[PDB]
């Protein structure tokens, strides 16, 4: 272990007194030694703490210490850039530029795989970041001018511009940025304009199209629609399999521009993109299956296809509709999008759904009323034969609601599970909105679409838990789209067939799914349940019966469904109806003991809050007070001869808590001397509060704080 002391004393002296070979051995030693790793790493941070000047001359005199020396420079730059004088740091910057030009101009850099090039570019980035605004106004023109000499220099500068586009908030300030840098932007376009037409080098063109893609939004419109740029991207760079995915992004970015003086060129863009896409991809080709076997590169084309069609059509569909000739091409392109919409993935679905939402929204705002059950809306007439495909598509693809909790595993196992954030939920809400619009377009077709698949489900044909889940989720999202007289006639058939489906299905695996679907599909229709009493009775009784279920997740969901029903239908529970002589709440209060036994305590609390909300709706003078008495008689009786549930019912029932609060009021103060916040906050009688409940405070409460 004597050599360890020699190697330790060797490195400490050379730094404060530089030799290349001794520096080389150390960085290799740390990588190939266990102790050497830790000791030299500590030695590296100790050497880095000193200063920079040894670094640059170390570079001048290699790859491992290049990464090392670049770490030294990059780190010391961010620290002392504000401290050092502007001229000296600019001198370091000139050294960086010269190093970049030199190393990028060497053919062996390509054989070096350009790792040193990438890191050296990062250093330029870190410098340019803080320097650019107040130091270099000509950096743009300098790079453009230096890119006109060689290939490697140019393409590397395209990477630089790409990185500059990464390190470069507000609408107005960005528009001022465009108007101020438009002069410097024209040159950046002209460079790419030159390369794309004159160059034979694919690696150069790829980075060129990448940079032109990123700088496209800021570049003035005069260099875009007034030139052959659109036709160039159409005929030349669209066909080539090398640039198929990167050029599609550019055309997408082109389509995002708001029309002002240019109208025809956009139609030409659409016609030519479709002319070339129909040749690139066949209409008969299934997109989903080609995406499944699609390579990493093959998928980006499809995603960019959906991204493009959505981007363009959202702005210029009106311009395409206007001409009678473009109507056919629009139908074909819409067909294309409809095909792409069938790809099973997280991203692409939301991308094309972003279009379907907008589509449904516009013609809904045109004609809110459904047709039918002439004067056909002009906007509807065009999209008419492609509308029913969207409804048929939207119903089957809808995701899980935030309300219900039932999850299927890949092996076919059913279980309750909660998922992260709002990504899966926000999607569901969006599909819900879109389907609502489309349902408003025609409720008849929507009715038939759902009735047909329900009949196939009752028959059992193609019956899987997921297949019924998607449908019932759809029906739950339709809530409020159809008129009362039509909604009743339609929903009663759905409920009846759903109950019969629950009867046919055997086992807990099926029963859990059917209960889940039947609970969510019920909770979303309170306006139907308040119309029919006996119907609501059968439903709520089914809830209470499903709270007897042993399978986890079902009963917890049944409690939430009960709350969801109790909230809106609160007025229908207390009153004695025409069909039944005894109030439903009265029946519940004597039957609760057998129901709440299987439930978790946390679920029981929610159940009590539901009952408290039901009984709080009734007035009827002293009648509701007697019902509150009967409701809380069981837990409260043993108190005279826990409080959390009491204050829960206090906030649930509301102000008329005086009948139960009064009897236990005095004892609270008497024991406390040895709940009010909730009642007072909910009380509507300040006159009674101040003159009765307020005086017994001073002695028991105010003096207590002193004592």
What does this structure look like?
- Among the domains are: 345-524, no CATH class; 619-706, no CATH class.
- Helix content is 73%, strand content 1%.
- The protein is an all-alpha fold.
- The longest helix is centred in the N-terminal third of the chain and has 28 residues, at 171-198.
- The protein is built from 38 helices and 2 strands.
- The protein has a two-stranded antiparallel sheet.
- It has helices at residues 2-16, 20-32, 34-48, 54-60, 63-80, 86-104, 108-111, 115-131, 139-146, 151-164, 171-198, 202-214, 229-235, 244-255, 264-280, 287-292, 296-322, 326-340, 346-366, 378-397, 423-441, 443-459, 465-478, 484-504, 507-523, 526-529, 533-546, 554-568, 570-574, 584-595, 601-615, 622-640, 643-653, 658-661, 665-673, 676-682, 686-693, 698-706; strands spanning 407-408, 414-415.
- The termini are far apart.
- HEAT repeats lie at residues 200-223, 224-260, 337-446, 489-527, 534-571, 576-613.
- Its main location: cytoplasm.
- One of its GO terms (cellular component) is kinetochore.
- The modification Phosphotyrosine is found at residue 428.
Write the topology of this structure.
Blueprint: H1 2-16, H2 20-32, H3 34-48, H4 54-60, H5 63-80, H6 86-104, H7 108-111, H8 115-131, H9 139-146, H10 151-164, H11 171-198, H12 202-214, H13 229-235, H14 244-255, H15 264-280, H16 287-292, H17 296-322, H18 326-340, H19 346-366, H20 378-397, E1 407-408, E2 414-415, H21 423-441, H22 443-459, H23 465-478, H24 484-504, H25 507-523, H26 526-529, H27 533-546, H28 554-568, H29 570-574, H30 584-595, H31 601-615, H32 622-640, H33 643-653, H34 658-661, H35 665-673, H36 676-682, H37 686-693, H38 698-706
Antiparallel strand pairs: 1-2
Helix pairs in contact: 2-3, 4-5, 5-8, 6-8, 8-10, 10-12, 11-12, 12-14, 13-15, 14-17, 17-18, 17-19, 18-20, 19-21, 20-21, 20-22, 20-23, 21-22, 22-24, 23-25, 24-25, 25-28, 27-28, 28-31, 31-33
PDB class: protein transport
Keywords: heat repeat protein, nucleocytoplasmic transport of protein and RNP cargoes
Assembly: monomeric
């Amino acid at each position: 272990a004597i050599m360890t002391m020699l190697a330790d004393h060797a490195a400490r002296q050379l730094l404060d007194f530089k030799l290349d070979i001794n520096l080389l051995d150390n960085v290799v030693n740390c990588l190939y030694h266990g102790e050497g790793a830790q000791q030299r790493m500590a030695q590296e941070v100790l050497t880095h703490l000193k200063e920079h000047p040894d670094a640059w001359t170390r570079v001048d005199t290699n790859m491992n210490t290049k990464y090392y020396g670049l770490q030294i420079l990059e780190n010391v730059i961010k620290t002392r850039w504000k401290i050092l004088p502007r001229n000296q740091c600019e001198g370091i910057k000139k050294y960086v530029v010269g190093l970049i030009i030199k190393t990028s101009s060497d053919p062996t850099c390509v054989e070096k795989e350009k790792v040193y090039i990438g890191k050296l570019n990062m250093i330029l980035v870190q410098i340019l970041k803080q320097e650019w605004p107040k130091h270099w106004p000509t950096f743009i023109s300098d790079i453009v001018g230096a890119s006109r000499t060689s290939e490697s220099l140019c393409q590397n500068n395209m990477v630089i511009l790409k990185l500059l586009s990464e390190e470069v908030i507000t609408q107005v300030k960005s528009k001022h940025l465009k108007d101020s840098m438009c002069n410097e932007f024209s040159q950046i376009f002209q460079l790419c304009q030159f390369v794309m037409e004159n160059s034979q080098n694919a690696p150069l063109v790829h980075a060129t199209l990448e940079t032109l893609l990123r700088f496209l939004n800021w570049i003035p419109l005069g260099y875009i629609f007034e030139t052959k740029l659109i036709s160039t991207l159409i005929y030349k760079f669209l066909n080539v399999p090398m640039f198929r995915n990167v050029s599609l992004k550019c055309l997408t970015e082109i389509a995002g521009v708001s029309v002002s003086q240019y109208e025809e060129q956009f139609v030409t863009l659409f016609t030519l993109t479709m002319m070339q896409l129909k040749q690139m991809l066949p209409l008969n080709t299934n997109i989903r299956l080609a995406y499944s076997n699609g390579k990493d590169d093959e998928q980006n084309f499809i995603q960019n296809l959906s991204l493009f069609l959505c981007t363009f059509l959202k702005e210029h569909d009106q311009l395409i509709e206007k001409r009678l000739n473009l109507r056919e091409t629009l139908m074909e392109a819409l067909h294309y999008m409809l095909l792409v919409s069938e790809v099973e993935e997280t991203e692409i679905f939301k991308i094309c759904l972003e279009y379907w939402n907008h589509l449904a929204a516009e013609l809904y705002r045109e004609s809110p009323f459904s047709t039918s059950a002439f004067d056909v809306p002009p906007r509807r007439q065009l999209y008419l034969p492609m509308l029913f495909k969207v409804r048929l598509l939207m119903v089957s693809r809808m995701a899980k609601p935030e309300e219900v909790l039932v999850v299927e595993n890949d092996q076919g196992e059913v279980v309750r599970e909660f998922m992260k954030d709002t990504d899966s939920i926000n999607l569901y809400k969006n599909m819900r909105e879109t389907l609502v619009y489309l349902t408003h377009l025609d409720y008849v077709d929507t009715e038939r679409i759902m009735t047909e698949k329900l009949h196939n489900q009752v028959n059992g044909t193609e019956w899987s838990w997921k297949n019924l889940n998607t449908l019932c989720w759809a029906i739950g999202s339709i809530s409020g789209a159809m008129h009362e007289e039509d909604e009743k006639r339609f929903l009663v058939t759905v409920i009846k067939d759903l109950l019969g489906l629950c009867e046919q299905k055997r086992g807990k695996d099926n029963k859990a799914i059917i209960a889940s679907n039947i609970m969510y599909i019920v909770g979303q229709y309170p306006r139907f349940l308040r119309a029919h009493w006996k119907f609501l009775k059968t439903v709520v009784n089914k809830l209470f019966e499903f709270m007897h279920e042993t399978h986890d997740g079902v009963q917890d969901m049944a409690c939430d469904t009960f709350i969801k029903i109790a909230q809106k239908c609160r007025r229908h529970f207390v009153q004695v109806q025409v069909g039944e002589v005894m109030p439903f709440i009265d029946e519940i209060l004597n039957n609760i003991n057998t129901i709440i036994c299987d439930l978790q305590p946390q679920q029981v609390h929610t159940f009590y809050e539901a009952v408290g909300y039901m009984i709080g709706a009734q007035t009827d003078q002293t009648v509701q007070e007697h019902l509150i008495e009967k409701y809380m008689l069981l837990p409260n009786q043993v108190w005279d001869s826990i409080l959390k549930t009491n204050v829960r019912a206090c906030k649930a029932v509301g102000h008329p808590f005086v009948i139960q609060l009064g009897r236990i009021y005095l004892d609270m103060l008497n024991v406390y001397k040895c709940l009010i916040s909730g009642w007072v906050s909910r009380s509507n009688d300040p006159q009674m509060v101040a003159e009765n409940f307020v005086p017994p405070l001073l002695d028991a409460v105010l003096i207590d704080y002193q004592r």
